[PDB]
């Protein structure tokens, strides 16, 4: 918690709470200037609650006095915390205007609304007059700058607490909060700036949940020693496909090759295996003889033999989901002593007891529907539920990659959030590519967690590099964009 | 005094002294970043005294911790004021290193020296170890950033107190200080940034001594109504020249015309009057018949007749200085009921009783040699002596324009400092141009003080627009550059 970090910074380091509050407010002023240009032509409406978020607002309002066209504070609380009171007091000594009633037509006379109503740790549903004011600000068309978190977002979850401010700019302090990172909060945050307000860098660094950044991914990318050969860069087996789903294997395989893997082999039911090499002849696509077009226990021994000469096995994309696939998948993973990347239909039939028993590592890559089915909960209970994902990862000894617009990657100890990507990834085939990427990076020497971190980022970044409208992005185009994402990362 | 402004801001407005100190120090960090780029590659040596300047230094050092390559504070004082002590305490709690001995070789290990040794209001000559340290920093070749004022400059006068830091960058608070504006201090200041640290804008504005800025000159420049004629823009008489000094009249006259004056007439001894129209035939150059090539009382009545049909009279450039010139100048000014711009040899022969008796206004434009002779003091007693200039202006009911690299313009109530210009103005003819400019602006409707303010600025700015090396600038080239200075001002 930043709440804890503020407390330690005040109580143990001895920084006056007022100094933190001053730094917070001036950082909002500087951020607005960076975004709007010269502030002197704008009229500012500052909405202050009674808490320290409001206190930060009074500092903003006071620092705009005499410099901008007009400033008014509407004070919406009933009582003020000590730092809010002190800064209210300064704003008034400096000649500032405060009113305590919100008049709908007051929005008419201002260009920018500074939302300092509620901050982090707000827990209750907003109703009554706070709601009305927030709804009026949202309909007003004005530029909205939110102090810390848009008022009405739960800063621990990203949920809207009945209603919430939609900001053009949010200025937060120290670190991004979970509510900036997860949706809907991420959407309501608008452009996010993270200000340094003077916390010791050691406390800022102690946070155990992180946003995955370019710099983090660049320092995890494996080295490519010049004197190398394909085995230097690992070997992947991908067990995938069926008579129903012949495309999945192809997309996973190329996903491994595009991130620099040395050798990729697919095991796919004949004749669907032939689809992959007609499209990308650099793939090895082994024909697996099946009774009805789906993997079954009769293919167990062939798949374990194929496994011996690879570094990692991805399983699941397009396998189908029937009882014989279920038997095969669970018996295979129980016997495979290689890292496993488990996706799609391998998740749908997975017996989670098998994961506890494995000595080798695993990465699971469910979307929330798949996660929901796996732990027997509703999609709504699991979506963006990073604590559930952490517990699952810790209990089953795996890395969990819970896919959504913000993807969560956790091994139960460390949790990372991915924010790259766009809606073109919301389309069949996208996940199959990511599964290949993750396997590939594990094969090249990254840990399951590192492989997942780099892969989710690059998969999202590749999507963003599509030249045309994102809704026209397809998995095949995404594959083409991977090596550009890699080059841009460096 | 800013000292007073800090006190009122703390004691009457209620801003915690620590909040002012925090804002000061972070403003230094931001300024250095603007100048150096990313700070993370630099090692910083911060030299802190015991006073609040040192306190500001501790804030700088503390805010660099964990962000830059290395930070060390050398604490040079013997005791610490309360805010310095508090910020020393924070720097140490944050993990910062302080030593109390300055080792000459310590400069070897750092890229930037932050000079927070002494601030404003230092009064005594620096000797002993402070001097040695300051001299070592000056020989070191490192980048030097001075907090408030370079240590060793007297912030009220700009004098060096035995020795002083030579800064690449100085970051001051609220307003520039006199010691940044006057030399040598102006030279030692290097690039000056003035930070807003949260004083009420009303107190910042109450300062009665100002630097002349572009924006101030732009808002004083007269209007040019389209439906106008030459009389709209005034008429100047310039009484100037002699058989010895035939060029002066020409340069003064064109100086009036280049700033937009409608009509300019010169009165110059025949045949030297003919020099002016051979060079600029738009001038009227009236031949004055003299006995020996110099104005005398025999020309009094002609000059007073010529005066009736003008708005302003400039007198002095190249008149010569002998007894008959003295009689003429004093009798003329005692009788002339028009504004007078008094320069050069008219200053040298001026009886200051005559100025007290005049009902009409005057501007005097001495360089320090001329000022020294006028009040019977040494050049050293008068140079940059803004209090003497104010008293003189107040006592004699005039505007005094005391020329030097920083020019002082005062009517005894308001005092303005000009910082435009370069060394190409240190050459004969330069002053003659300025005298014409001032007269011209008075003729166009500006007050003597306004006319002087706009003229010193534009005269200096024109010099800066010379395309080649400044030492090759001549008065004739300066005249050519005036209308460009004007266009650039708009």
């Amino acid at each position: 918690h930043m709440k804890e970090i503020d407390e330690l910074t005040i109580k143990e380091y001895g920084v006056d709470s007022r100094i933190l509050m001053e730094r917070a407010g001036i950082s909002v002023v500087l951020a607005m200037e960076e975004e709007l240009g010269n502030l002197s032509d704008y009229r500012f409406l500052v909405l202050c609650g009674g808490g320290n978020n409001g206190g930060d607002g009074f500092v903003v309002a006071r620092n705009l006095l005499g410099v901008v066209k007009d400033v008014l504070v509407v004070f919406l609380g009933k009582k003020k915390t000590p730092d809010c009171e002190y800064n209210y007091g300064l704003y008034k000594k400096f000649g500032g205007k405060v009113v305590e009633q919100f008049e709908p037509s007051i929005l008419n006379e201002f260009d920018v609304v500074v939302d300092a109503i509620f901050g982090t740790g707000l827990r209750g549903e907003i109703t009554g007059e706070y709601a009305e004011i927030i709804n009026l600000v949202n309909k007003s068309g004005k530029v909205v700058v939110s102090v810390d978190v848009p008022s009405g977002i739960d800063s621990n979850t990203g949920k809207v607490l009945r209603t919430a401010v939609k900001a053009d700019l949010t200025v937060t302090f120290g670190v991004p909060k979970i509510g900036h990172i997860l949706f809907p909060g991420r959407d309501l945050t608008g452009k996010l700036k993270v200000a340094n307000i003077g916390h010791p860098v050691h406390l800022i660094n102690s946070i155990n949940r992180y946003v995955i950044t370019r710099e983090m991914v660049r320092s995890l990318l494996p080295e490519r020693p010049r004197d190398s050969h394909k085995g230097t860069y690992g070997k992947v087996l991908i067990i995938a496909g069926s008579r129903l789903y012949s495309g999945a294997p192809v997309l996973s395989g190329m996903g491994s090759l595009k991130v620099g893997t040395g050798l990729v082999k697919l095991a796919v039911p004949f004749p669907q295996n032939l689809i992959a090499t007609s499209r990308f002849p650099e793939l090895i696509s082994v024909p697996i003889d099946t009774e009805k077009g789906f993997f079954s226990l009769q293919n167990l021994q062939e798949c374990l033999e194929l496994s011996k000469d690879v570094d990692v096995v991805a399983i699941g994309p397009g396998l189908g989901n029937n009882e014989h696939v279920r038997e095969f998948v669970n018996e295979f993973l129980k016997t495979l002593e290689k890292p496993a990347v488990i996706d799609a239909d391998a998740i749908n039939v997975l017996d989670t007891s098998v994961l506890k028993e494995r000595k080798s590592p695993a990465v699971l890559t469910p979307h929330p529907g798949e996660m929901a089915r796996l732990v027997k909960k509703t999609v709504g209970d699991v979506k963006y539920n990073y604590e559930l994902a952490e517990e699952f990862a810790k209990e089953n000894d795996c890395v969990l990659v819970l896919k959504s617009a913000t993807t969560i990657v956790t091994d139960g100890e460390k949790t990372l959030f991915n924010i790259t990507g766009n809606t073109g990834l919301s389309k069949g085939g996208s996940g199959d590519v990511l599964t290949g990427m993750i396997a590939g990076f594990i094969a090249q020497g990254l840990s399951p967690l590192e492989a997942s971190t780099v892969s989710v980022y690059l998969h999202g970044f590749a999507a963003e590099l599509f030249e045309q409208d994102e809704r026209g992005l397809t998995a095949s185009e995404l594959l083409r964009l991977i090596p550009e994402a890699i080059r841009r990362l460096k | 005094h800013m000292k007073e402004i800090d006190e009122l801001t703390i004691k009457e407005y209620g801003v915690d002294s620590r909040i002012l100190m925090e804002r000061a120090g972070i403003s230094v960090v931001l300024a250095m970043e603007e100048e150096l780029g990313n700070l993370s590659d630099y090692r910083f040596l911060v030299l802190c005294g015991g006073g609040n300047n040192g306190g500001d230094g501790f804030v700088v050092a503390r805010n660099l911790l964990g962000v830059v390559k290395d930070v060390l504070v050398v604490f040079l004082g013997k005791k610490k004021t309360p805010d310095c002590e508090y910020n020393y305490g924070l720097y140490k709690k944050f993990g910062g290193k302080v030593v109390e001995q300055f080792e000459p070789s310590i400069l070897n290990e750092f890229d930037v020296v932050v000079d927070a040794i002494f601030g404003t209001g230092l009064r005594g000559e620096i000797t002993g170890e402070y001097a040695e340290i300051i001299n070592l920093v000056n020989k070191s070749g490192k980048v030097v950033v001075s907090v408030d004022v370079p240590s060793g400059i007297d912030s009220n006068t700009g004098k060096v107190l035995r020795t002083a830091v030579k800064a690449d960058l100085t970051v001051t608070f609220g307003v520039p200080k006199i010691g940044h504006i006057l030399f040598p201090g102006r030279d030692l200041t290097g690039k000056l940034k003035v930070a807003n640290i949260g004083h009420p804008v009303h107190l910042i504005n109450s300062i009665n001594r100002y630097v002349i800025t572009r924006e101030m000159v732009r808002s004083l420049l007269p209007e040019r109504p389209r439906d106008s004629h030459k009389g709209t823009y005034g008429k100047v008489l310039i009484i100037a020249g002699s058989r010895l000094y035939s060029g002066a009249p020409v340069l003064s006259g064109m100086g009036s015309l280049k700033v937009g004056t409608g009509l300019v007439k010169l009165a110059v001894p025949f045949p030297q009057n003919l020099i002016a129209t051979s060079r600029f035939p738009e001038l009227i150059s009236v031949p004055i018949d003299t006995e020996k090539g110099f104005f005398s009382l025999q020309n009094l009545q002609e000059c007073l007749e010529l005066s009736k049909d003008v708005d302003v009279v400039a007198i002095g450039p190249g008149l010569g200085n002998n007894e008959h010139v003295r009689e003429f100048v004093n009798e003329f000014l005692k009788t002339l009921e028009k504004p007078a711009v008094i320069d050069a040899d008219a200053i040298n022969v001026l009886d200051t009783s005559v100025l007290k008796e005049r009902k009409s206004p005057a501007v005097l434009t001495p360089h320090p040699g001329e000022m020294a002779r006028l009040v019977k003091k040494t050049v050293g007693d008068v140079k940059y002596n803004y209090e003497l200039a104010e008293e003189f202006a107040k006592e004699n009911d005039c505007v005094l324009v005391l020329k030097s690299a920083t020019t002082i313009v005062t009517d005894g109530e308001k005092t303005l400092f000009n910082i435009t210009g370069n060394t190409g103005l240190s050459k004969g003819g330069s002053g003659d141009v300025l005298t014409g400019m001032i007269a011209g602006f008075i003729a166009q409707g500006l007050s003597p003080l306004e006319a002087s303010t706009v003229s010193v600025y534009l005269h200096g700015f024109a010099a800066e627009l010379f395309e080649q090396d400044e030492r090759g600038l001549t008065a004739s080239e300066l005249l050519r550059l005036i209308p460009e200075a004007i266009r650039r001002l708009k």
């Binding site: 950082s27 951020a31 960076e34 700036k193 340094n196 | 960090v29 993370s40």
Partner: peptide, 6 residues
């Protein structure tokens, strides 16, 4: 970068 992460 001293003040803001963006």
């Amino acid at each position: 970068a001293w003040l803001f992460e963006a």
